[PDB]
């Protein structure tokens, strides 16, 4: 699924997305830049925290600056956070099960969905304003491993900076409340579909690995049959991790055998 929320403020955002405690189980954040806007800025690969933070403030390495300081406060909205969450069975198998290929499958599915989101990129150019498609965004993807309930959950925070290049200049992303022609409005209207696109893309890959899937909800929500999702549904990263492993062992589920059955059943 894909959750949508506005990024709070430049600083705390920087700290949240790169906070080690959010990806302790994964061991890595696996962050990377994405979006045609990023390639145009020369931003590729790993994300430097200072550059990411300044970007959320509206300051580009390009030299362009969209910050609007009003008595110590920046009124430039940082951007949006689109979170793609993998199904519980995948998260368990990836993080507690050892199958790292599923993390990679999760990334590729997220990468795929984010491209379709980028196509909605637009800016407001009042000639009466109007929205004009831009087709480029600057994004930073960060992987986290825990849900709000402290259960295993592989999810990627797709942070979309509030900037976009139009006719050479960097402008803020479109916002149209009334006609709902703005970028964010178009994202909301397709929230389900995008989360759907990500899930479908992830499903194809997991099935190519030899894994089975089963629809457990609406809009195609699915889980890998047989995985004890139940056990994980209902302060110190190291202790939390030890607990997850402990409650899993107590489910009696033989993870490795599950993996081998997928292998001897793939190709
Ligand atoms: Mg998180």
Swiss-Prot record:
Changing residue 23 to F: Reduced DNA nicking ability. Residues 1-267 are annotated as: DNA relaxase. It is found in: Cytoplasm. Disruption phenotype: Loss of conjugative DNA transfer. Transmembrane segments: none annotated. Mg(2+) binds at residues 144, 155, 157. The active site is at 16 (o-(5'-phospho-dna)-tyrosine intermediate), 17 (relaxase). Has 4 domains; the relaxase domain (residues 1-330), an unknown domain (residues 330-990), the helicase domain (residues 990-1450) and the C-terminal domain (1450-1756) which is required for conjugative DNA transfer, possibly via interaction with TraM. Monomer. Part of the relaxosome, a complex composed of plasmid-encodes TraI, TraM, TraY and host-encoded IHF bound to the F plasmid origin of transfer (oriT). Directly contacts coupling protein TraD. Seems to directly contact TraM via its C-terminus. To TraI of plasmid IncFII R100. Conjugative DNA transfer (CDT) is the unidirectional transfer of ssDNA plasmid from a donor to a recipient cell. It is the central mechanism by which antibiotic resistance and virulence factors are propagated in bacterial populations. Part of the relaxosome, which facilitates a site- and strand-specific cut in the origin of transfer by TraI, at the nic site. Relaxosome formation requires binding of IHF and TraY to the oriT region, which then facilitates binding of TraI relaxase. TraI forms a covalent 5'-phosphotyrosine intermediate linkage to the ssDNA. TraI has also been identified as DNA helicase I. DNA. helicase I is a potent, highly processive DNA-dependent ATPase, able to unwind about 1.1 kb dsDNA per second in a 5' to 3' manner. This is Multifunctional conjugation protein TraI. The gene is traI. The chain holds residues 1 to 300 of 1756 of the full protein.
